[PDB]
UniProtKB/Swiss-Prot annotation, chain A:
Changing P109S: Confers resistance to lodenosine. Changing K65E: Confers resistance to adefovir and lamivudine. This is p51 RT. Changing K91Q: Confers resistance to efavirenz. The chain holds residues 593 to 1019 of 1435 of the full protein. Changing E39D: Confers resistance to zidovudine. A motif (Tryptophan repeat motif) lies at residues 368-384. Changing V96A: Confers resistance to nevirapine. The record marks W371, W384 as: Essential for RT p66/p51 heterodimerization. Changing D62G: Confers multi-NRTI resistance. Changing T356I: Confers resistance to abacavir, lamivudine and zidovudine. Changing A57V: Confers multi-NRTI resistance. Changing I125M: Confers resistance to delavirdine, efavirenz and nevirapine. Changing N49D: Confers resistance to stavudine.
Length: 402, 543
């Protein structure tokens, strides 16, 4: 038997379009879907089912294989909630491991009355063929109800390995598992496999996660421009630290001197910059997460492969702030850098508050929508919007480690 | 007799009831024909006379088919349709000739009455009940219900399409070297089989379709090549674009010119040389679609040129997966681009052109990036992959731009093709303040209510100026200031301002704008040898 799962009150099922798929990706998904059909996992469905959810093909590790990635983001939002907490020790361990457990859902039937909602389509090159319509019979991998129904069942399978050593913290987010152990490299991986092997019947260290502060440019010689820069940025920063002053600096500016002239900083203007640096020396007090609020995360392309982000909920009240430097491979590709960054950030989020943030991406919707799945790795998919990076928000965070 | 297949389960738009209306009274002439028909169908097992327990009803109509000249039946399902469940209908994914792989031969099967060849979900049948009216309402109307997919009903194309799919399931499996494209009432079936082996296989599907309840299309209504498939003629080795003609007259109305213009714009895709500046000009200040307009001399000319160009034979080769997919792009003017995808040189699979949208602001590299990728998407749709691009831009320039452009951006694998004019950065603001050059401290202001604007400058070199402006916006003066800075400065300038828009330009370095002031400013910018736009916060006086 299976638990009845319904959509939230007053919601209809997902009717999303399937964006175009690369030939290599279609072929694969068909191959993938045939086996599941045989295995009774998905069932071809007709035109009486007006729903739809998108599917894509991503790539795994050491098995040059493709994985069916379904985007249930919309379905999920429309899915009833599952109650009617996050172990904060995970974000502290100098080591966590990403493991997938979504493969486990196929052994658990899906309420017949909800299956139509998991409807999806495999596209056709040039549309010389109908979309191979299917629908899930079991718990759909990547769906939110899945980790939930398989919870009681995930409690029992996990229980022994947990009771083994209450030390370790394992977090179950959607289809993944984050295993925490403070033991050295070989140590973590060794106790890691026991869990994995036990499951038959990446090594992250949440410490280097320094919400890196701001540093103001020390300078032997200051020009009008340099001040203009400095000042223009302090004024933005005052939106965060309201104790940041720019007056004594601006006095050194009263005048139409040449941009390149060297301005000697008055002693008064001196203390004010000094005061400003102190203020910047630590995060704005009073910023603490709120569970009932959506966690926001916007990213700024900084150039030279550098990237900056901030996760918050209340504007200017950043819960964390960081930078990204393209992985030695992402070079001529911002899309790869942007994907990696998004995924990096998203995991950091989960590990800390157990939810993915909503991204504000400095990319054109159309450029993102076309190539992101070619570099995507995560079994889950964040919410995302597209924006136009305001000129100073970037510059402010440009003031990093340099 | 019809198909013994599983009926798709239909439900009325989740939450309503079947339609019902007083049957539009018809003449005895019509009514008569209507009975003949309905009885024929009744025996073919298509519709069924029924009992007075049916609260539902749809209007039947007899239209003199302006083809065979006899009375035909037509049921008006507008109401039933506006209460039938929505079905999966993404079939608006019409192949493009360019993506079809060449086939040794194609054969087109007719399966027209097939909607009538597929049964209707017994539960839903009731709602389709229609009635044949009686002479002056004498012997109450003959009552019928549909047993099969009624033509004109919402779910038929979908259901019929899926049914056909289930039935082809077997065949295709058995012979995975026979391509079948299902479109409306035809099955375009082709192969690379020897014409005799192909001819046998088609015959086979036919005896299979018959096996399945779909009757065979008599050798009178047999469609043969070239295939006239909307917009094109599909010949065996090539596909052509159906010639578009311009309806000439000596009196053109608004409506006329608009339709023309719309038709000429369409032609602009396969014909990058179609112009409509003059023709479109004839729209200025019109007064009614019925209004008659005389073409300018230039318009008459333009029309003339377009006629000739439209004569030149347009077509393309088909898809050979064994060869590269190449795409070349040219900029035919600011904000207009041409591409032509082909596997073999000259053998264009397809060509086309993109346009601008008077972008409030962009550079041509961005615009080039948008065209490339737009192409990329249609290439993926048509051929399941992306073309090796051959773009009119120096890689040096490309590397240079994308490096620091604030927005994420990329061009897939591409190579450089020196087919002028090349795409470049019209200007580049200097990275640091310019040593030596004058420094323009600009400022603009305006009383938003009065529009009495004021904008000026003060240079470190004593030079200064202030211009009076009436009917200007805060924004205008702000920019005008910068514009004055530029009109009056040497080959190198430093300009400081508080304008948030100026800053919005420092980041983007646009060269196309919505605002002409900003377009004129872009002018001054490209003229200069060195330009350094620096920004500082307003409401605090520096000059
Ligand atoms: C069977 C279909 C999918 C198909 C076709 C027909 C076709 C006709 C209309 C709409 C779509 C397809 N052609 C069109 O080629 C025209 C043609 C005419 C005569 C002989 C061979 C080919 C082709 O080149 N390859 C194909 O695979």
């Amino acid at each position: 038997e299976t638990v009845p799962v319904k959509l939230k009150p007053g919601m209809d099922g997902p009717k999303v379009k399937q964006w175009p798929l690369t030939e290599e990706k279609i072929k694969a998904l068909v191959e993938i879907c045939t086996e599941m059909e045989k295995e009774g996992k998905i069932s071809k469905i007709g035109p009486e089912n007006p729903y739809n959810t998108p599917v894509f093909a991503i790539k795994k590790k050491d098995s040059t294989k493709w994985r069916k990635l379904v985007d249930f983001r919309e379905l999920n939002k429309r899915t009833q909630d599952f109650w009617e907490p996050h172990p904060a020790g995970l974000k502290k361990k100098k080591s966590v491991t990403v493991l997938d457990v979504g493969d486990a859902y196929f052994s658990v039937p899906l309420d017949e009355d909800f299956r139509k909602y998991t409807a999806f389509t495999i596209p056709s090159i040039n549309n010389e063929t109908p979309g191979i319509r299917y629908q899930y019979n079991v718990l759909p991998q990547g769906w939110k109800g899945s980790p939930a129904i398989f919870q009681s069942s995930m409690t029992k399978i996990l229980e022994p390995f947990r009771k083994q050593n209450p030390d370790i913290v394992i977090y179950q987010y959607m289809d993944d598992l984050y295993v925490g152990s403070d033991l050295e490299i070989g140590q973590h991986r060794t106790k890691i496999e026991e869990l994995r092997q036990h499951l038959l019947r990446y090594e992250l260290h949440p410490d280097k996660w320094t919400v890196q502060p701001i540093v103001l440019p020390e300078k032997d010689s200051w020009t009008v421009n340099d001040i203009q820069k400095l000042v223009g940025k302090l004024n933005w920063a005052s939106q965060i630290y309201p104790g940041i002053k720019v007056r004594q600096l601006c006095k050194l500016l009263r005048g139409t001197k040449a941009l390149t002239e060297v301005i000697p900083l008055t002693e008064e203007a001196e203390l004010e910059l000094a005061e400003n640096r102190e203020i910047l020396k630590e995060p704005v007090h009073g910023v603490y997460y709120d569970p009932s609020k959506d966690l926001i995360a916007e990213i700024q392309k900084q150039g030279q492969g550098q990237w900056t982000y901030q996760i918050y909920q209340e504007p200017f009240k950043n819960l964390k702030t960081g930078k990204y430097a393209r992985m030695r491979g992402a070079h001529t590709n911002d899309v790869k850098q942007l994907t990696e960054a998004v995924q990096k950030i998203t995991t950091e989020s989960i590990v800390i508050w157990g939810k993915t943030p909503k991204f504000k991406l400095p990319i054109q919707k159309e450029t993102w929508e076309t190539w992101w799945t070619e570099y995507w790795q995560a079994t889950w998919i964040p919410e995302w919007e597209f924006v136009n990076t305001p000129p100073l928000v970037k510059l402010w965070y440009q003031l990093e480690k340099e | 007799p019809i198909s013994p297949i599983e009926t798709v389960p239909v439900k009325l738009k989740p939450g309503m009831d079947g339609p019902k209306v007083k049957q539009w009274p018809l003449t005895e002439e019509k009514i008569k024909a209507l009975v003949e028909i309905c009885t024929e169908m009744e025996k073919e097992g298509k519709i069924s006379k029924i009992g007075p327990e049916n609260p539902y009803n749809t209007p039947v109509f007899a239209i003199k088919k302006k083809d065979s000249t006899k009375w035909r039946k037509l049921v008006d399902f507008r109401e039933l349709n506006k209460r039938t469940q929505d079905f999966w209908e993404v079939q608006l994914g019409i192949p493009h000739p360019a993506g079809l792989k060449k086939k040794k031969s194609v054969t087109v099967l007719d399966v027209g009455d097939a909607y009538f060849s597929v049964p209707l979900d017994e539960d839903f049948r009731k709602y389709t009940a229609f009635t044949i009216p009686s002479i002056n309402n004498e012997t109450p109307g003959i009552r019928y219900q549909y047993n099969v997919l009624p033509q004109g009903w919402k779910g038929s194309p979908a259901i019929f399409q899926s049914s056909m799919t289930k039935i082809l399931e077997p065949f295709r499996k058995q012979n995975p070297d026979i391509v079948i494209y299902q479109y409306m009432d035809d099955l375009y079936v082709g192969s690379d089989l020897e014409i005799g082996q192909h001819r046998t296989k088609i015959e086979e599907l036919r005896q299979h379709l018959l096996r399945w309840g779909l009757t065979t299309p008599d050798k009178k209504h047999q469609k043969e090549p070239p295939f006239l498939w909307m917009g094109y003629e599909l010949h065996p080795d090539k596909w052509t674009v159906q010639p578009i003609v311009l309806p000439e007259k000596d009196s053109w109305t608004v409506n006329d010119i608009q339709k023309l213009v719309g038709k000429l714009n369409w032609a602009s895709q396969i014909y990058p040389g179609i112009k409509v500046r003059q023709l479109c000009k004839l729209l200025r200040g019109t007064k009614a679609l019925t209004e008659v307009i005389p073409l300018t001399e230039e318009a008459e000319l333009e029309l003339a040129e377009n006629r000739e160009i439209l004569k030149e034979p347009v077509h393309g080769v088909y898809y050979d997966p064994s060869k590269d997919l190449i795409a070349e792009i040219q900029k035919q003017g600011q904000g207009q681009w041409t591409y032509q995808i082909y596997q073999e040189p000259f053998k264009n699979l397809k060509t086309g052109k993109y346009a601008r949208m008077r972008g409030a602001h962009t550079n041509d590299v961005k615009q080039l990036t948008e065209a490339v990728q737009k192409i990329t998407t249609e290439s993926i749709v048509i051929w399941g992959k992306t073309p090796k691009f051959k773009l009119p831009i120096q890689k040096e320039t490309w590397e240079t731009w994308w490096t620091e452009y604030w927005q994420a951006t990329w061009i897939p694998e591409w190579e450089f093709v020196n087919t002028p004019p090349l795409v470049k950065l019209w200007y580049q603001l200097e990275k640091e303040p310019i040593v030596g050059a004058e420094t323009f401290y600009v400022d603009g202001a305006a009383n938003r209510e009065t529009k009495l604007g004021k904008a000026g400058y003060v240079t470190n070199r004593g030079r200064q100026k202030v211009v009076t402006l009436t009917d200007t916006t805060n924004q205008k003066t702000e920019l005008q200031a910068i514009y004055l800075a530029l009109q009056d400065s040497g080959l190198e300038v430093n300009i400081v301002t508080d304008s948030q828009y100026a800053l919005g330009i420092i980041q983007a370095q646009p060269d196309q704008s919505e605002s002409e002031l900003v377009n004129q400013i872009i002018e001054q910018l490209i003229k200069k040898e060195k330009v350094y736009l620096a920004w500082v916060p307003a409401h605090k006086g520096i000059g």
